[PDB]
Amino acid sequence: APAANDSSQATLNFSGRVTSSLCQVKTDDLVKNISLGEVSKSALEATGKSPAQSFQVNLINCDSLTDDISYVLADANNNGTTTAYLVPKSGDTAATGVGVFVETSKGTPVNIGSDQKLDVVANKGNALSEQVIPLRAYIGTQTRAAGAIGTDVTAGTVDATGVLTIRAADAT
Amino acid sequence: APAANDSSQATLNFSGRVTSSLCQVKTDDLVKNISLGEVSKSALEATGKSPAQSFQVNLINCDSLTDDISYVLADANNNGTTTAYLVPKSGDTAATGVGVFVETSKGTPVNIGSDQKLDVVANKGNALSEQVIPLRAYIGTQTRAAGAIGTDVTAGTVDATGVLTIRAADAT
Amino acid sequence: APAANDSSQATLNFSGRVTSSLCQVKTDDLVKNISLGEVSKSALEATGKSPAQSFQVNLINCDSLTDDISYVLADANNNGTTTAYLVPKSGDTAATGVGVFVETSKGTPVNIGSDQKLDVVANKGNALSEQVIPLRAYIGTQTRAAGAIGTDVTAGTVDATGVLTIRAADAT
Amino acid sequence: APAANDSSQATLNFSGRVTSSLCQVKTDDLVKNISLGEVSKSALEATGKSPAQSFQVNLINCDSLTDDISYVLADANNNGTTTAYLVPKSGDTAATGVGVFVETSKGTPVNIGSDQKLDVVANKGNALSEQVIPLRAYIGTQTRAAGAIGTDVTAGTVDATGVLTIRAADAT
Amino acid sequence: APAANDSSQATLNFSGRVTSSLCQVKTDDLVKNISLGEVSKSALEATGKSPAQSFQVNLINCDSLTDDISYVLADANNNGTTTAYLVPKSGDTAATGVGVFVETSKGTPVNIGSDQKLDVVANKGNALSEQVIPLRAYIGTQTRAAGAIGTDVTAGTVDATGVLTIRAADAT
Amino acid sequence: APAANDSSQATLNFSGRVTSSLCQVKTDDLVKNISLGEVSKSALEATGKSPAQSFQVNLINCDSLTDDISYVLADANNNGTTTAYLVPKSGDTAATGVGVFVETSKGTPVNIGSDQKLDVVANKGNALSEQVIPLRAYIGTQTRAAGAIGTDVTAGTVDATGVLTIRAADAT
Amino acid sequence: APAANDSSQATLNFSGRVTSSLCQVKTDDLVKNISLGEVSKSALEATGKSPAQSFQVNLINCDSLTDDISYVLADANNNGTTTAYLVPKSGDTAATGVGVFVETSKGTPVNIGSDQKLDVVANKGNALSEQVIPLRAYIGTQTRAAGAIGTDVTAGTVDATGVLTIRAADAT
């Protein structure tokens, strides 16, 4: 007779990548969930910004001979270098009139699609295995000035996603 | 020839809000994880409760003109005001006959869906930025009386979720 | 017109249990973080160990009639009784060939999965409320002998997870 | 019938490292919490600094043949040697225009990422087990001059994190 | 080949503030650990109090032109002016029906959230650098009268927290 | 606009208890720090002990009707009645094979966990307010005999913690 | 029902050491508190010093076969042997431009890090039980010359700490 369908299963979906870079991105940092604050009414009408939150992307197991490291912040919901911010995704509750700005830890803006340079940490000519890219981010009005709810800005959720492309190689 | 698929990426999912309130909820208080105790057998049969744990929800960057602040405790797994506790979620190991009761720091019950009042702290008429909502919660039997395991309660984990809605606004 | 999505929210995730034991575990001890030392090269090559650190797990609100308390040490990353240590987790920076050993405060090895006995401290036949389990732990080589970096051990981080199951019951 | 989920558990998370240095870092110095003062308004307008506080990093169980010890101060929220201070993290209540300057106990500035040398204490050619790194720290204005709250500084909290990498080796 | 993860490190978490006050609070008075007595049975039943202990909060480096100094005692586990005591925190062993009353060194009660005044010690018109706030505290029943363990009070621990906000300003 | 975070603050963490005993423990004796000597090489090889130091535990504000007083010595790093000494805590520098032996002021041994009797000092049928518990202690080898460093003992620090549970009652 | 938390507790934290030296350091001398003078304006501008104060260090229970005693003064807030003084610890009230100079009872400077020789006092070939190290100490300008407050020296408190390592051995 046909065999009975009484098996107990567990499905394991593995995933990964093969890359040409010399430095991994830490397995816990391949998908970040950076939680910015709330653009309350008072802050919105006063300065048009929320306080900036710091975060990092950690490289790990870098090659000893790594010489140059550079990264690019490319928006995953837009194309072109005309916008300074990251455009949030639309949806049922999406809030219109705001965007997510990213900056370097000292306040220098990070432009979309423009590559920055990272300085390798070396000890006696060998690069250390762990290296860190420090960054900032905050929600602000698209016009970079105070806004009033309903005139230009609207209340709701903000969900924006960016992608960092990292290129660690040996110069010569 | 087609370009090689050899890039190294990190995905940065930002999130936030835009609200009409005048006070932020502190960025690390947007998702609490309050760990209550264990309702051991002796405690369950003696008075049917666990000792209550204290916790706070901190507001920050409040507007100077904030005058009236209120909050509402709402359940994520139930609707209506007929129930006094927060209903635990169900699952493989969830326990039956148990609920989560929340209270103010002095022991006055915090009913679901009924708004409370928070007294604002001000210095010379201008509210201080940082303001706190103190609360307290314990796991107890639904009947609010002692009860052994088997007859009405069953061993397992207790996981419940509440949601506080906070409305800081200027009276006039 | 449809309502505006402009609420300010805080999420409160309560968690707990309902057990069959007579004794609680102190709410601060449901998740321990014991920070063992560093197995430097000198101590690695000398005896293959680090100095042993001490830690405790406190029971509280025990029942007056508690007659017997026993506990079992179980591993979160291995099965059976064929190993003496706790196998570290694996990751980008995990070190290989080292494990974590746990001992009673006097140096009696604590085996994995074998019941230990805890003497209840009493006052005139009624057990006190608070009772303590003292333990000790160190990082060592799996072979339990000196060993250099390269031949068997490699440098990295060490993370291990055990779980104590405590059974306070009244014999009769 | 299926077993009941009524076990009482305590979770033990052990952690540590394995290294290549010949000296341990004292188990309680692996994570410091230095509490610099408060940069009051008077001291801010006078010289833009707070009084320098002292702290230590203790090495223990050094090797008898330890010949050379060097330590490097790396900032955990910035890259490169473009800055003399440690850039504070950002947040809801962070203060702008401020940084944390570190120094040797005698007032010699400690630059970021540049190797220092530590003299080993010896008794007849054998290094003593314990050896101490003394340091200073103070909160100061980024421009290294007086500055009023409003024009360049703003009131708030200062949190900075630096990392000391200690390398003990035997020259020959 | 990838670099090896063999660094030995120490983490330094600096912290601090920036304020608009003219006076510092002494760096070791930013967090007091005041140890009140033990409310024995005899003392509890006689007058429902423990003998009151003294403590101080020292300001330092005040401004030569400091003129007006005020402080406010704010409770960290309650809001409003309804209560005279600091509400103890709740937990596994906390004691019910008890509070922590604060007073001036002479015995005048200190109410929560009500401005007090401090006289500034001056020498020829210029305020001295160091100035002191002497206080007193005791653990007494909530009803302010005798009470036995069982009927209203219960044995346990008493942890309570207040926060002093000091405002030293130049009136003119 | 949002209020500024420019407050200067002091935190006051009060602590205490509510007990069932009639006698307080003097608030300075709740946490003793008793310094024993140094077990030198000569005294270690001669008799394996250090000269015994004396200390006290003071009770104050005893009830007039106090009739019976008792106390017990309990170890904080060990269990049971097998061992006659207090097991030292483990750490980077802890010494092996030595313990702390406690004795009555005359030289009688005080065994762990077995209650002693304290005579109540009275004046005309009513107990005096203050009553003292005199004790003694020293560091000595666990074998209670001579022992050399290297063979069984090892040079290091010694930290041990006992706990005195005092039970003053009115028998009748 | 769960037992009540009503015990009365006293905590005894013992401490000590096991050493290899033949002589104990007298238990009252393990932590000296030497109180130097005040460097007033007159002495500061005359010679930049305060009068030397005499202190003492007692050794007790020496072995009868002791033959060679040597002691080294090590600073606990500095490293190396370039400085002749002990660098004061920094803080809110510390004074700049000042240092502590230590000397032998006859005026011979005691350089930090270099061994000194103590002569054993014997009676018929056997060392006495008690032996003494006499010393001096004074606060002086770091330039070892007259200084003026407000130019190279600032008024304030001076706190410094040294550590004598004492090594008593039997030559043959």
Side-chain angles (χ1 to χ4, degrees):
Chain A
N5 301 288
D6 61 2
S7 180
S8 173
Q9 302 294 323
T11 305
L12 312 180
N13 297 319
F14 302 107
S15 57
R17 288 211 285 271
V18 182
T19 76
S20 69
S21 177
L22 294 174
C23 290
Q24 293 187 25
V25 176
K26 187 176 293 227
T27 302
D28 313 279
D29 276 329
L30 286 167
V31 183
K32 301 296 299 297
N33 282 281
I34 300 102
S35 178
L36 315 180
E38 312 190 316
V39 183
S40 70
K41 192 167 147 306
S42 62
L44 181 50
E45 311 215 350
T47 307
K49 290 198 280 263
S50 77
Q53 315 286 133
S54 278
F55 64 90
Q56 314 160 33
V57 180
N58 285 276
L59 285 56
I60 191 67
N61 279 120
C62 278
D63 193 35
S64 310
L65 274 60
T66 300
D67 188 358
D68 183 38
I69 306 181
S70 64
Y71 63 91
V72 192
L73 179 74
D75 198 349
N77 192 3
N78 191 36
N79 67 66
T81 52
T82 300
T83 44
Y85 50 97
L86 289 88
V87 192
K89 285 150 193 262
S90 304
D92 311 78
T93 59
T96 186
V98 286
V100 170
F101 300 79
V102 182
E103 301 165 298
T104 303
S105 61
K106 304 191 48 49
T108 308
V110 167
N111 292 335
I112 317 304
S114 303
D115 59 352
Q116 277 73 41
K117 173 174 173 279
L118 191 77
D119 297 83
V120 296
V121 177
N123 166 74
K124 293 182 183 293
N126 300 313
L128 305 191
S129 81
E130 191 145 40
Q131 308 208 22
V132 174
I133 296 150
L135 292 163
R136 270 160 55 131
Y138 66 90
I139 303 167
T141 309
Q142 291 179 359
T143 61
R144 315 203 81 164
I149 282 193
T151 64
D152 47 346
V153 203
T154 294
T157 298
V158 177
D159 294 358
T161 180
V163 176
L164 272 170
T165 298
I166 295 152
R167 300 181 175 96
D170 181 24
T172 286
Chain B
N5 296 292
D6 63 28
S7 301
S8 173
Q9 315 272 341
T11 306
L12 308 169
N13 294 319
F14 305 99
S15 62
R17 305 195 201 227
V18 186
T19 69
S20 195
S21 179
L22 289 174
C23 288
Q24 289 188 23
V25 180
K26 199 199 287 280
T27 296
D28 63 358
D29 291 331
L30 293 168
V31 186
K32 297 296 299 295
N33 280 279
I34 298 105
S35 170
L36 310 176
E38 320 188 319
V39 179
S40 68
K41 177 177 170 64
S42 83
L44 185 49
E45 285 168 14
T47 182
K49 286 139 68 172
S50 80
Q53 318 289 317
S54 280
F55 63 90
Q56 324 163 40
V57 185
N58 292 58
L59 286 57
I60 199 69
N61 286 306
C62 280
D63 192 58
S64 309
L65 272 43
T66 308
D67 172 324
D68 191 326
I69 298 184
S70 304
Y71 66 93
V72 191
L73 181 72
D75 195 348
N77 189 19
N78 185 311
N79 67 67
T81 55
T82 315
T83 311
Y85 50 99
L86 282 72
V87 190
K89 289 174 288 189
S90 307
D92 291 355
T93 60
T96 75
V98 176
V100 175
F101 302 82
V102 182
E103 313 183 312
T104 62
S105 59
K106 297 192 57 42
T108 308
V110 175
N111 289 322
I112 308 302
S114 66
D115 69 82
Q116 275 77 49
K117 187 213 196 71
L118 187 85
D119 283 358
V120 303
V121 174
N123 165 74
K124 312 223 182 83
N126 302 315
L128 300 188
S129 83
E130 203 265 320
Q131 310 206 21
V132 186
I133 294 151
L135 297 162
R136 187 177 71 190
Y138 62 93
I139 303 172
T141 302
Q142 290 175 357
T143 62
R144 308 189 92 156
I149 286 171
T151 84
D152 63 0
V153 174
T154 300
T157 57
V158 172
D159 304 336
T161 304
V163 185
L164 275 168
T165 294
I166 293 153
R167 318 180 203 248
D170 193 348
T172 288
Chain C
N5 303 293
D6 62 28
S7 296
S8 170
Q9 312 261 324
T11 298
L12 308 173
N13 293 319
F14 309 99
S15 63
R17 313 189 201 224
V18 181
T19 63
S20 194
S21 179
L22 289 172
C23 288
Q24 289 189 23
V25 181
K26 177 149 78 45
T27 295
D28 202 354
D29 283 28
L30 288 167
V31 182
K32 298 298 300 296
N33 276 279
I34 300 106
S35 51
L36 311 178
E38 320 189 340
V39 181
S40 71
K41 179 183 166 303
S42 302
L44 181 49
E45 262 155 19
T47 68
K49 296 198 288 292
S50 76
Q53 316 285 320
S54 279
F55 63 93
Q56 287 189 331
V57 185
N58 292 59
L59 290 60
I60 191 62
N61 291 314
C62 280
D63 191 89
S64 307
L65 314 170
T66 306
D67 273 308
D68 197 56
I69 301 183
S70 66
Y71 65 92
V72 178
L73 178 71
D75 192 352
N77 200 47
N78 193 4
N79 267 36
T81 58
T82 317
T83 45
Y85 46 90
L86 293 91
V87 192
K89 295 270 162 32
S90 311
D92 312 278
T93 57
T96 79
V98 307
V100 173
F101 300 80
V102 181
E103 310 178 312
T104 295
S105 61
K106 298 193 292 280
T108 309
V110 179
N111 289 320
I112 308 300
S114 69
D115 273 30
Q116 269 76 42
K117 180 190 209 265
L118 192 78
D119 286 356
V120 302
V121 183
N123 188 359
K124 310 213 212 151
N126 300 316
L128 297 190
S129 84
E130 181 176 90
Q131 314 205 23
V132 177
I133 293 154
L135 291 155
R136 188 176 69 189
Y138 64 93
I139 297 173
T141 309
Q142 288 184 356
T143 64
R144 315 196 80 167
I149 284 169
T151 80
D152 54 345
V153 175
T154 70
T157 317
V158 174
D159 301 359
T161 312
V163 183
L164 276 163
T165 293
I166 297 169
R167 297 181 175 94
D170 181 10
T172 291
Chain D
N5 303 296
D6 66 3
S7 81
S8 172
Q9 311 259 318
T11 304
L12 309 180
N13 302 323
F14 306 106
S15 59
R17 311 184 204 218
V18 184
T19 69
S20 195
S21 181
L22 291 171
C23 293
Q24 292 188 22
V25 177
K26 190 174 287 194
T27 296
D28 54 69
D29 291 331
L30 298 171
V31 179
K32 303 296 295 291
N33 278 281
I34 299 101
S35 53
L36 311 178
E38 315 191 317
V39 183
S40 72
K41 180 173 168 60
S42 284
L44 178 50
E45 299 206 78
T47 56
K49 296 155 53 183
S50 81
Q53 317 289 323
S54 276
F55 60 96
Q56 274 144 40
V57 181
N58 289 58
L59 289 55
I60 191 67
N61 288 314
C62 280
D63 204 29
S64 314
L65 301 93
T66 306
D67 216 334
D68 204 59
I69 304 183
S70 299
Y71 65 87
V72 176
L73 177 71
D75 190 345
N77 199 9
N78 196 34
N79 67 59
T81 57
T82 304
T83 43
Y85 48 94
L86 278 55
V87 191
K89 280 127 64 168
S90 308
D92 311 296
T93 58
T96 61
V98 175
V100 172
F101 296 80
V102 177
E103 311 176 313
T104 293
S105 62
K106 302 193 294 282
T108 308
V110 170
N111 297 322
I112 298 284
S114 86
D115 288 86
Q116 268 78 0
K117 173 172 172 278
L118 179 63
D119 304 78
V120 301
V121 177
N123 164 78
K124 314 283 211 53
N126 301 316
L128 301 195
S129 80
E130 196 202 40
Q131 314 202 22
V132 178
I133 287 150
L135 288 159
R136 268 156 56 133
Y138 65 99
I139 299 171
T141 311
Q142 286 178 352
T143 54
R144 315 198 80 165
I149 289 169
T151 79
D152 55 339
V153 176
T154 66
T157 298
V158 175
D159 283 28
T161 300
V163 176
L164 275 168
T165 288
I166 298 152
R167 295 182 172 96
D170 183 8
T172 288
Chain E
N5 303 299
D6 61 0
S7 298
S8 172
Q9 288 178 346
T11 308
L12 311 171
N13 297 316
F14 309 106
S15 60
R17 314 184 203 224
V18 185
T19 77
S20 197
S21 182
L22 291 171
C23 293
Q24 290 187 20
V25 180
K26 206 162 57 48
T27 300
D28 63 358
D29 291 331
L30 297 170
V31 178
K32 303 291 294 295
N33 286 283
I34 299 102
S35 165
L36 312 179
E38 315 184 319
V39 181
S40 69
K41 190 165 78 175
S42 66
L44 180 53
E45 285 185 18
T47 177
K49 292 154 52 181
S50 79
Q53 320 285 135
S54 278
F55 61 93
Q56 283 133 27
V57 185
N58 291 60
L59 285 53
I60 191 68
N61 286 311
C62 279
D63 206 26
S64 309
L65 311 95
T66 306
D67 184 52
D68 180 78
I69 301 185
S70 300
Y71 63 88
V72 178
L73 178 75
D75 192 350
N77 195 27
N78 197 317
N79 67 63
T81 60
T82 304
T83 46
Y85 50 91
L86 300 174
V87 190
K89 288 178 286 187
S90 306
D92 291 331
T93 64
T96 70
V98 175
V100 173
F101 302 80
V102 185
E103 308 175 310
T104 75
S105 66
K106 301 191 56 42
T108 309
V110 166
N111 295 318
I112 304 299
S114 299
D115 285 326
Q116 267 70 43
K117 201 151 74 55
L118 182 87
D119 189 358
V120 302
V121 189
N123 167 75
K124 292 195 313 278
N126 302 319
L128 301 189
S129 79
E130 177 163 29
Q131 314 210 24
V132 181
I133 292 149
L135 291 161
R136 192 174 74 188
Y138 58 92
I139 300 170
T141 312
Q142 287 177 355
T143 62
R144 313 199 83 163
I149 289 170
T151 61
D152 40 337
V153 176
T154 62
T157 302
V158 176
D159 312 300
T161 299
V163 175
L164 276 170
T165 298
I166 296 153
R167 298 177 173 95
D170 183 9
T172 289
Chain F
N5 309 299
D6 60 38
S7 299
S8 171
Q9 301 207 129
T11 305
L12 312 172
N13 299 317
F14 305 98
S15 62
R17 313 186 204 227
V18 183
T19 70
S20 198
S21 175
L22 298 175
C23 292
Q24 294 187 23
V25 179
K26 193 177 289 191
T27 294
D28 299 319
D29 283 28
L30 291 165
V31 180
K32 300 297 298 295
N33 286 281
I34 298 103
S35 181
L36 313 177
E38 319 184 319
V39 181
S40 71
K41 181 178 171 64
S42 87
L44 182 52
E45 305 200 318
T47 180
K49 287 189 305 220
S50 73
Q53 317 283 136
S54 277
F55 66 89
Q56 293 180 350
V57 182
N58 297 72
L59 288 53
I60 190 64
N61 288 312
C62 282
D63 189 23
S64 305
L65 311 172
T66 305
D67 203 68
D68 186 74
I69 302 181
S70 299
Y71 64 89
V72 176
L73 184 72
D75 195 352
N77 198 31
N78 185 18
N79 272 137
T81 61
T82 318
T83 48
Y85 54 99
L86 282 70
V87 193
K89 286 258 164 205
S90 308
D92 292 331
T93 55
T96 42
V98 307
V100 173
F101 301 79
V102 177
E103 312 166 80
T104 301
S105 64
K106 313 192 54 49
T108 304
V110 166
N111 292 320
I112 306 308
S114 65
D115 60 344
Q116 269 76 29
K117 184 189 210 54
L118 185 68
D119 271 22
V120 177
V121 176
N123 170 76
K124 312 263 191 73
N126 306 318
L128 299 190
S129 79
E130 180 155 90
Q131 312 198 26
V132 65
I133 300 151
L135 291 157
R136 195 173 77 187
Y138 65 88
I139 301 168
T141 308
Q142 294 180 354
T143 56
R144 264 163 141 171
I149 287 172
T151 62
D152 33 356
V153 174
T154 64
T157 299
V158 171
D159 302 338
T161 305
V163 178
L164 272 163
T165 300
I166 292 152
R167 299 177 175 94
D170 191 7
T172 290
Chain G
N5 306 292
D6 64 5
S7 51
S8 172
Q9 300 283 321
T11 304
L12 309 176
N13 303 320
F14 305 108
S15 64
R17 311 183 202 222
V18 181
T19 70
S20 72
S21 179
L22 294 170
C23 297
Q24 300 182 24
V25 174
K26 197 175 189 295
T27 296
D28 312 289
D29 276 8
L30 291 166
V31 187
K32 299 294 293 291
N33 286 58
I34 302 103
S35 179
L36 313 180
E38 316 189 317
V39 184
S40 69
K41 184 184 287 293
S42 298
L44 189 57
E45 306 184 320
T47 61
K49 285 184 292 222
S50 76
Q53 314 284 322
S54 281
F55 67 85
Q56 183 178 178
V57 187
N58 282 293
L59 287 54
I60 192 67
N61 294 318
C62 280
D63 192 28
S64 304
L65 311 163
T66 300
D67 269 309
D68 186 74
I69 301 184
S70 301
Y71 63 94
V72 193
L73 176 70
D75 194 15
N77 193 1
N78 188 34
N79 70 31
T81 58
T82 299
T83 56
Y85 50 96
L86 289 90
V87 177
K89 273 191 149 271
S90 312
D92 304 307
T93 57
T96 68
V98 171
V100 175
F101 299 74
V102 180
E103 297 180 353
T104 294
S105 61
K106 312 175 59 40
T108 314
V110 169
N111 296 319
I112 65 155
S114 65
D115 307 89
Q116 263 72 38
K117 189 171 183 178
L118 189 81
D119 273 29
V120 171
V121 175
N123 167 78
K124 307 205 207 315
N126 302 319
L128 298 184
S129 78
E130 181 147 280
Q131 308 200 25
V132 181
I133 304 156
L135 292 161
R136 270 155 58 140
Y138 64 89
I139 302 169
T141 310
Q142 287 178 353
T143 56
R144 294 179 67 188
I149 298 191
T151 71
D152 66 342
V153 182
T154 41
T157 291
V158 175
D159 282 28
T161 187
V163 186
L164 294 174
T165 295
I166 292 152
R167 299 179 172 94
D170 183 359
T172 289

XYZ file of all heavy atoms in Angstrom, chain E residues 128-154:
196
model
N 32.120 81.541 48.626
C 33.161 80.538 48.753
C 32.909 79.404 47.767
O 31.795 79.202 47.287
C 33.216 79.997 50.178
C 33.469 81.015 51.287
C 33.707 80.311 52.605
C 34.645 81.900 50.947
N 33.970 78.657 47.462
C 33.861 77.633 46.431
C 32.979 76.474 46.881
O 32.079 76.061 46.144
C 35.246 77.129 46.039
O 35.732 76.217 46.998
N 33.201 75.948 48.079
C 32.497 74.761 48.553
C 31.328 75.146 49.441
O 31.486 75.942 50.369
C 33.429 73.829 49.322
C 32.706 72.621 49.884
C 33.641 71.502 50.285
O 34.797 71.794 50.654
O 33.217 70.328 50.228
N 30.166 74.557 49.170
C 28.958 74.810 49.939
C 28.196 73.504 50.105
O 28.209 72.651 49.218
C 28.103 75.865 49.253
C 28.924 77.049 48.812
C 28.145 78.318 48.806
O 27.158 78.446 49.516
N 28.594 79.283 48.022
N 27.524 73.355 51.241
C 27.050 72.056 51.700
C 25.552 72.118 51.946
O 25.030 73.151 52.374
C 27.787 71.616 52.978
C 27.313 70.247 53.430
C 29.280 71.607 52.736
N 24.872 71.011 51.677
C 23.434 70.872 51.893
C 23.224 69.764 52.919
O 23.258 68.584 52.545
C 22.704 70.539 50.584
C 22.758 71.722 49.621
C 21.272 70.129 50.859
C 22.765 71.311 48.188
N 22.997 70.080 54.190
C 22.840 69.019 55.189
C 21.412 68.517 55.283
O 20.484 69.326 55.359
C 23.272 69.709 56.479
C 22.866 71.126 56.276
C 22.885 71.414 54.800
N 21.216 67.201 55.301
C 19.880 66.623 55.300
C 19.826 65.472 56.292
O 20.798 65.173 56.987
C 19.474 66.141 53.904
C 19.230 67.211 52.846
C 19.307 66.604 51.470
C 17.891 67.862 53.060
N 18.666 64.832 56.356
C 18.399 63.764 57.303
C 17.275 62.895 56.760
O 16.460 63.357 55.965
C 18.042 64.356 58.662
C 18.023 63.372 59.775
C 17.806 64.041 61.108
N 16.439 64.490 61.311
C 16.051 65.240 62.330
N 16.910 65.675 63.236
N 14.765 65.549 62.456
N 17.230 61.634 57.184
C 16.231 60.712 56.655
C 16.004 59.558 57.618
O 16.888 59.194 58.391
C 16.655 60.161 55.294
N 14.810 58.976 57.551
C 14.467 57.810 58.352
C 13.361 57.024 57.670
O 12.605 57.564 56.866
C 14.021 58.202 59.759
C 12.835 59.127 59.802
C 11.555 58.633 59.896
C 13.000 60.494 59.763
C 10.477 59.470 59.943
C 11.928 61.335 59.811
C 10.668 60.820 59.897
O 9.587 61.664 59.942
N 13.265 55.748 58.007
C 12.257 54.862 57.436
C 11.090 54.766 58.407
O 11.226 54.201 59.496
C 12.845 53.473 57.155
C 14.000 53.574 56.166
C 11.794 52.565 56.619
C 14.774 52.305 56.027
N 9.935 55.286 58.006
C 8.781 55.301 58.878
C 7.531 54.877 58.138
O 7.436 54.993 56.916
N 6.560 54.400 58.907
C 5.337 53.870 58.324
C 4.640 54.937 57.489
O 4.882 56.133 57.653
C 4.403 53.366 59.421
O 5.137 52.546 60.335
C 3.293 52.536 58.825
N 3.785 54.490 56.566
C 3.073 55.419 55.697
C 2.009 56.201 56.449
O 1.707 57.340 56.084
C 2.441 54.665 54.532
C 3.433 54.195 53.488
C 2.781 53.390 52.384
O 1.587 53.095 52.440
N 3.556 53.037 51.367
N 1.420 55.612 57.486
C 0.373 56.277 58.252
C 0.916 57.246 59.291
O 0.136 58.013 59.860
C -0.507 55.244 58.957
O 0.284 54.482 59.875
C -1.140 54.311 57.951
N 2.222 57.232 59.552
C 2.830 58.106 60.552
C 2.317 57.782 61.953
O 1.960 58.671 62.726
C 2.593 59.574 60.204
C 2.892 59.895 58.757
C 3.099 61.380 58.527
N 4.456 61.804 58.847
C 4.993 62.950 58.451
N 4.318 63.810 57.706
N 6.240 63.241 58.808
N 2.279 56.494 62.280
C 1.906 56.042 63.612
C 2.366 54.603 63.779
O 2.798 53.954 62.826
C 0.401 56.160 63.846
N 2.259 54.103 65.003
C 2.704 52.748 65.280
C 1.911 51.741 64.450
O 0.744 51.952 64.115
C 2.556 52.431 66.767
N 2.566 50.632 64.116
C 1.937 49.593 63.324
C 2.711 48.293 63.352
O 3.936 48.297 63.231
N 2.014 47.174 63.505
C 2.680 45.895 63.667
C 2.871 45.204 62.323
O 2.126 45.426 61.368
C 1.878 44.989 64.599
N 3.889 44.346 62.262
C 4.113 43.535 61.073
C 2.968 42.547 60.942
O 2.619 41.848 61.901
C 5.463 42.817 61.155
C 6.605 43.820 60.995
C 5.548 41.727 60.102
C 7.963 43.250 61.299
N 2.354 42.515 59.766
C 1.224 41.640 59.522
C -0.025 42.434 59.181
O -0.571 42.300 58.089
N -0.480 43.259 60.118
C -1.677 44.077 59.913
C -1.564 45.124 58.803
O -2.510 45.317 58.042
C -2.132 44.764 61.213
O -1.098 45.631 61.684
C -2.437 43.734 62.282
N -0.423 45.803 58.707
C -0.238 46.827 57.675
C 1.165 46.831 57.068
O 1.329 47.048 55.874
C -0.608 48.219 58.198
C -0.148 48.451 59.621
O 0.049 47.460 60.348
O 0.015 49.623 60.014
N 2.168 46.610 57.902
C 3.555 46.549 57.461
C 3.950 45.093 57.289
O 3.377 44.195 57.915
C 4.480 47.266 58.464
C 5.926 47.122 58.050
C 4.100 48.728 58.576
N 4.926 44.845 56.418
C 5.489 43.517 56.231
C 6.997 43.624 56.080
O 7.515 44.618 55.570
C 4.896 42.813 55.011
O 5.206 43.554 53.827
C 3.387 42.692 55.150
